Design a protein around this ligand. Structure first.
Ligand SMILES: C=C1CC[C@H](O)C/C1=C/C=C1\CCC[C@]2(C)[C@@H]([C@H](C)CCCC(C)(C)O)CC[C@@H]12
Length: 129
């Protein structure tokens, strides 16, 4: 019932879609005009480009995403969330290592009543060029 519990549930489906290598399913968790802002990197705009991003990560051999949601605050048709992510991905030596990052993001109640991602700002913890 809680917005926090609703988002954590949505992120649970997010992880399942990714581990099934279903980039379209992953992208369906986003608003059509959603945007991702990786810090010191190019922003990714629109559902299809976001699908391309997650598909690209799958192709790289990125796997086992683990999401840790901190607090979630509701404001009108928006929900504000902060959290952290850990996953397995290739280093500059092509070897698979544990990679971590932090994020804040804004969800929006779509046409349905369900929560969909709208804005995400994220960074990879220092540790590929
Ligand atoms: C993985 C690797 C490690 C190997 C290469 O560095 C490529 C790389 C990219 C990581 C990214 C860049 C794009 C933005 C990402 C994917 C962040 C996500 C957008 C964070 C938000 C995740 C969610 C689902 C909670 O909303 C986390 C990691 C970031």
């Amino acid at each position: 019932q809680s917005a926090k519990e609703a988002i954590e549930a949505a992120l649970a489906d997010f992880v399942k879609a990714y581990n099934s290598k279903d980039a379209a399913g992953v992208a369906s968790k986003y608003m059509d005009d959603a945007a991702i802002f990786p810090l010191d990197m190019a922003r990714v705009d629109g559902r299809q480009n976001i699908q391309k991003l997650w598909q690209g990560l799958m192709d790289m051999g990125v796997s086992e995403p683990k999401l840790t949601t901190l607090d979630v605050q509701e404001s009108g048709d928006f929900a504000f969330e902060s959290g952290s992510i850990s996953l397995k991905g290739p280093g500059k030596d092509s070897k698979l290592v544990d990679i971590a990052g932090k994020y804040v993001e804004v969800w929006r109640k779509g046409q349905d009543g369900g929560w969909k991602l709208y804005r995400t700002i994220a960074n990879l913890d220092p540790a590929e060029h």
